Design a protein around this ligand. Structure first.
Ligand SMILES: O=C(O)/C=C/c1ccc(O)cc1
Length: 121
């Protein structure tokens, strides 16, 4: 679910999902178009694609369970949708952690019309 994703993001990065990742760049948050702005935005592009791979799941609202083993996120076994949603979220949260070094506050609330370019999943 979106709230669990937000908690996983905070756990990983130490940033609050809202506002750090809810409206960032072209892809983080509602909607997506154009060329991602940076590596963090690319995390969101791929997360969007990952949710797009699950047209008959409901990633915003379906809750999954996970634990940590030696630090690392381990998605626990729920329904097939829940497992797949968890893997998408885990990847994006790790990706955000990996790209905190280039995160730029200039991309928060980035305006949609500047999202020029084209990117297929
Ligand atoms: O917290 C939210 O409401 C959603 C954040 C979000 C993070 C990555 C995305 O690819 C799309 C939305």
């Amino acid at each position: 679910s979106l709230l669990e994703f937000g908690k996983m993001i905070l756990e990983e990065t130490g940033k609050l999902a809202i506002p750090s990742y809810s409206s960032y760049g072209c892809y983080c948050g509602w909607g997506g178009k154009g060329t991602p702005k940076d590596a963090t935005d690319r995390c969101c592009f791929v997360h969007d694609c990952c949710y797009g791979n699950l047209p008959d799941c409901n990633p915003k609202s379906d809750r999954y369970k996970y634990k940590r083993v030696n630090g690392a996120i381990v998605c626990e076994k729920g329904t097939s949708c829940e497992n797949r949603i968890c893997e998408c979220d885990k990847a994006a949260a790790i990706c955000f952690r990996q790209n905190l070094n280039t995160y730029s506050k200039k991309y928060m609330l980035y305006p949609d019309f500047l999202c020029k370019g084209e990117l297929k999943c």
